Design a protein around this ligand. Structure first.
Ligand SMILES: [Mg+2]
Ligand SMILES: [Mg+2]
Length: 758
RNA sequence: UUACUGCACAGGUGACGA
DNA sequence: TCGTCACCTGAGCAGTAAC
């Protein structure tokens, strides 16, 4: 019963002696840190400046001489550890600080992968993939009431294209439209310069420039994106260049797969544990045992949530460990009541794809047959419908048309619908060359707009998807079918819920950030999604129609109180019943907004019931990882010597980091794709400290179940649907806000029960 | 824009303080 | 205005679909 972390205990002194002085204006801190540099470690906290002597000798420092006990106030030494870790690795230059981040000294994976693939080119040496390590001192709590500091080791890869732009152009690479960044970024200076128009003298001409429209070939480099790597390498090598990428992926697997990551962390620890770490010239620390999550002793730090159940009726009796297995066997959760058993579906597609579209449609509606067990039955039989009528809407448009495609799609739709009575959904087929045009000429968003205005949800699809090989096509049709049925107001499946309290509501908010280009300030938009407890089941409620970032706290409030009102009427709560409201987002709410939300929900539900509220953040990007040494992994594909998921904790593993924080494992070996896939990073689930409901284990389990609620796919989602759906909504509504002739009027009328955002 | 995985780079940004 | 600790979202890339 044990999970291992990527962290080491740091054994610190009980206490440390310090000088303090009030400094209520923190503008002074920077100049004072400079003045006392080398003799003093300095730290501002709660309107006071704390000074720790590191070397003997001046300057002089005036203040109170107090002792800071590490058990009570671990922040002081946690902070000094940021610098001390750097000073403990003097041969490695910091590429970043706090956390100390640095590069492997010898290791360089493109050279290694080139050799491995037997590939060569004169400029390869100037494309660099270097392992990047970071050491993060973090406060954790083995047991409640006791804090410790750990040093957590993370590994990524620095991708950089050192090559001069002249050398790249002279080697035959078309730099037109590639992004370029500064070779040297001055203090607090913007890296991104813009896009390459052309090169004249010693000078790059930029468009979509961030500052000046020009820069010297020598001050600029290609940005280290995957786009610029593939663009350069395909030109210099292709289409062998894939093989270089696959060998590069093998090289990285040497650092990031479970056993290899565990080893790199061990080796890092061994190194740091070699000597004491100098906190000051008379004060030392020591890197100790690897931090573990277990229930040995007084610690209760790891549990395994039960497997999520996909449920397909109200009786609980029809359930399955996996969405598709369940859907196939049972059909959808709502088939007994599903009102519209003969849907009419508008199919909008370029006239020249007619044949390819008809085949796709036949496979969709009528299934692919018993040779493709992944999608045999087809939509009609899969969902328990009587039939699907297609209303074909060819459009006279070519893939080469970049400027009028959206006009052509929309005229065709309007013309076809005027004669064709009521359609219940649409399928819109798009050319790959049109998919990501700017929104003023983008047929996805324009047809989405027109049809949602008219109250018709759409499921769009790009031609490469339409043309997929049968083995791939079956999984596509599973997901396309699930979203389509939900777009028609269907509920494909629910997830199991153990009836605890008299009612439970979960609301989530999600963010989208929109601009036409990288030069243009991104504008924020929001979405709000609601999920209610049912009997044995979690049910999706209503979704926001306004996407307003300013005032989002009011919107969360408004949503919660409105819904609490409806739940009380529906369920007729009895005096003494308890109601639980949970909020989910990828960022924490302000204390003042938690206060306002609690205040209002409390008032709305009244004195007859008890309220419990939790405010949860879900984090994907933090310094923790969990390692399960007993997990042997699975066949990457049967029955190969190579394994995938080696050392990956099981899905639903929940580890305790601190009173407010749990780590949740989501991607088990079964869900991992490839032998080369790194050891997964778990979700960090964090409870807002003003929450009145405190069981973060239950909340972590709840977040996990809500990952299995996504009707965008058969496979589970990366974040609970409360947040995920809200993000999809935020992006769609925010984009639509700029599309002429868009009206949200039908979103709460014809589309009220449509999952139109999937 | 069937999706999942989430890499890489960029933009920066949030919360808490006083 | 600031210090401090922390990490979220968009673009484009590439491989795979929980028995
Ligand atoms: Mg979709
Ligand atoms: Mg990442």
């Amino acid at each position: 019963r044990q999970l291992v972390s990527n962290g080491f205990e740091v054994n610190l002194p009980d206490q440390v002696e310090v000088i303090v002085r009030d400094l209520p204006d923190p503008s002074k801190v920077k100049e004072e840190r400079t003045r006392l540099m080398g003799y003093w470690f300095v730290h501002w906290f709660d309107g006071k400046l704390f000074h720790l002597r590191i070397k003997a000798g001046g300057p002089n420092v005036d203040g109170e001489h107090r002792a800071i006990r590490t058990a009570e106030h671990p922040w002081l030494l946690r902070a000094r550890l940021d610098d001390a870790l750097e000073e403990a690795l003097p041969k490695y230059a910091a590429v970043k600080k706090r956390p100390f981040t640095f590069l492997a000294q010898k290791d360089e994976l493109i050279d290694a992968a080139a050799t491995a693939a037997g590939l060569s080119h004169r400029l390869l040496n100037s494309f660099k993939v270097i392992p990047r390590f970071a050491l993060s001192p973090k406060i954790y709590e083995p047991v409640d009431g006791t804090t410790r500091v750990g040093v957590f080791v993370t590994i990524g890869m620095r991708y950089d294209i050192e090559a001069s732009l002249r050398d790249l152009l002279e080697a035959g690479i078309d730099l037109r439209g590639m992004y370029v960044v500064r070779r040297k970024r001055q203090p607090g200076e913007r890296g991104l310069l813009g896009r390459v128009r052309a090169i004249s003298d010693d000078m790059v001409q930029l468009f979509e420039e961030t500052d000046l429209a020009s820069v010297n070939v020598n001050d600029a480099k290609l940005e280290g994106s995957k786009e610029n790597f593939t663009r350069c390498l395909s030109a210099l090598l292709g289409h062998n260049y894939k093989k270089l990428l696959n060998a590069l992926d093998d090289q990285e697997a040497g650092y990031r797969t479970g056993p290899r990551f565990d080893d790199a962390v061990r080796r890092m620890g061994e190194f740091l544990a070699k000597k004491p770490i100098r906190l000051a010239d008379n004060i030392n620390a020591q890197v100790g045992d690897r931090i573990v999550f277990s229930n040995e002793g007084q610690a209760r730090n790891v549990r395994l949530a039960p497997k999520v159940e996909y449920v397909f009726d109200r009786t609980g009796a029809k359930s399955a460990e996996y969405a598709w297995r369940g859907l196939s066997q049972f059909g959808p959760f709502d088939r007994p009541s599903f009102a519209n058993r003969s849907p009419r579906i508008l199919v909008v597609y370029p006239s020249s794809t007619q044949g390819k579209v008809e085949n796709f449609l036949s496979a969709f509606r009528d299934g692919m047959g018993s040779n493709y067990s992944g999608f045999s039955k087809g939509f009609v039989d899969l969902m328990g419908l009587t039939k699907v009528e297609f209303v074909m809407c060819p459009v006279e448009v070519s893939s080469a048309d970049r400027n009028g495609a959206h006009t052509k799609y929309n005229s065709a739709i309007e013309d076809k619908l005027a004669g064709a009575g009521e359609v219940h959904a649409g399928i819109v087929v798009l050319f790959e060359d049109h998919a990501r045009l700017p929104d003023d000429r983008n047929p996805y968003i324009h047809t989405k707009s027109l049809l949602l205005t008219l109250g018709v949800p759409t499921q769009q699809v790009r031609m490469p998807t339409v043309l997929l090989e049968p083995k791939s096509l079956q999984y596509t049709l599973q997901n396309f079918s699930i979203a389509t049925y939900a777009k028609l107001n269907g509920t494909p499946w629910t997830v199991n819920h153990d009836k605890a309290i008299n009612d439970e509501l979960v609301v989530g908010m999600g963010l989208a950030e929109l601009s036409g280009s990288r030069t243009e300030k991104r504008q924020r938009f929001v979405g709000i999604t609601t999920v209610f407890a049912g009997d044995g089941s979690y049910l999706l409620g209503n979704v926001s129609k306004e996407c307003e970032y300013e005032g989002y706290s009011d919107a969360i409030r408004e949503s919660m109180t409105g819904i609490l009102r409806e739940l009380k009427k529906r369920n007729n709560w009895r005096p003494g019943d308890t109601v639980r409201v949970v909020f989910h987002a990828h960022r924490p709410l302000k204390r003042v907004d938690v206060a306002s939300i609690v205040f209002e929900c409390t008032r709305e539900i009244g004195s007859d019931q008890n309220i419990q509220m939790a405010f949860v953040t879900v984090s994907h990007d933090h310094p923790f990882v969990l390692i399960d040494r007993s997990e042997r992994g699975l066949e990457a594909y049967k029955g190969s010597t190579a394994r995938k998921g080696v050392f990956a904790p099981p899905r639903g593993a929940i580890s305790r980091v601190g009173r407010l924080t749990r780590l949740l494992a989501v991607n088990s070996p079964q869900l991992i794709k490839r032998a080369n896939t790194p050891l997964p990073t778990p979700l960090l689930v964090s409870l807002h400290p003003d929450s009145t409901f405190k069981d973060v284990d239950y909340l972590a389990e709840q977040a996990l179940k809500f990952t299995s609620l996504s009707w965008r796919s058969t496979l589970p989602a990366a974040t609970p649907v409360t947040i995920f759906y809200s993000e999809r909504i935020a992006e769609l509504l925010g984009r639509l806000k700029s599309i002429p002739n868009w009206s949200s009027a039908n979103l709460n009328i014809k589309l009220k029960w449509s999952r139109w955002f999937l």
